[PDB]
Design a binder for this molecule. Structure first.
Ligand SMILES: O=P(O)(O)OC[C@H]1O[C@@](CO)(O[C@H]2O[C@H](CO)[C@@H](O)[C@H](O)[C@H]2O)[C@@H](O)[C@@H]1O
Length: 244
């Protein structure tokens, strides 16, 4: 029932520029009840609360963590979303396949969960191996989705997960219109947000994969901010004339 559903990425988007994070949160603090806020990050919920303590993030209404593999309500984890993502998912098999790749190194255990298998790509490896990985996984019949960001982070999630779907799920839950939604991002794990029908803002300092994506799929609901980090978010709000 609010006029805006603000969905932002953390690293290099909401966070990265303190002065901006501060004047963004200062502005949004004078009309806190006019929007719902959701952080969409690739970080675990624990690693996310940590960030909030370091940079002083403002308390969001929802936390779309681990690339949307987990959604945290004020009350707590969403078990319907979990069951939704658990359906047809075969973590063991997918991992067996992913591990078979030399160019891939498993990320620390604390970066994994029932619906998120992550690795790091060798700096000297050939990025096309990701496309080989994607295809090899796809052909298993298991609804899997490969996410590549920052040229090194590789995430294997269910087709039904990822920041964009997590966002769509939330939209329906809150009964919010795409026209009333704004997504903010900078990397490849943000692509799913822009695949959404919501309004979007790509921070100036965006990563190459996102900018590359934009060139090919960017539409009219996609705004390329002139500013970087939090500044992009304030700019996009003025652009789409949100919070009128
Ligand atoms: O998703 P962001 O909020 O934009 O954070 C990106 C940043 O997070 C780090 C820090 O741990 O890694 C997280 O995100 C990647 C990509 O989704 C995952 O593969 C990784 O497991 C997760 O911890 C960092 O690598 C990213 O730049």
């Amino acid at each position: 029932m609010r006029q805006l559903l603000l969905i932002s990425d953390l690293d290099n988007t909401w966070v990265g520029d303190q002065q901006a994070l501060e004047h963004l949160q200062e502005y949004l603090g004078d009309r806190r009840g006019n929007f719902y806020l959701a952080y969409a990050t690739g970080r675990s919920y624990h690693s996310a609360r940590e960030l909030q303590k370091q940079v002083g993030l403002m308390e969001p209404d929802y936390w779309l963590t681990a690339v949307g593999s987990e959604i945290y309500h004020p009350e707590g984890l969403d078990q319907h979303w979990a069951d939704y993502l658990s359906e047809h998912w075969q973590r063991d098999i997918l991992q067996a396949i992913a591990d078979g790749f030399e160019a891939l190194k498993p990320q620390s255990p604390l970066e994994q969960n029932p619906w998120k298998i992550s690795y790091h790509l060798d700096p000297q490896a050939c990025p096309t191996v990701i496309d080989q990985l994607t295809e090899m996984l796809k052909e298993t019949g298991i609804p899997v989705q490969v996410i590549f960001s920052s040229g090194k982070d590789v995430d294997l999630l269910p087709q039904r997960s990822n920041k964009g779907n997590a966002t769509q799920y939330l939209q329906q839950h809150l009964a919010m219109e795409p026209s009333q939604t704004l997504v903010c991002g900078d990397s490849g794990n943000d692509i799913g947000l822009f695949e959404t029908s919501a309004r979007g803002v790509i921070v100036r300092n965006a990563q190459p994969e996102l900018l590359h994506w934009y060139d090919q799929w960017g539409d009219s609901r996609h705004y390329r901010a002139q500013s970087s980090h939090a500044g992009a978010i304030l700019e996009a709000i003025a652009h789409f004339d949100f919070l009128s």
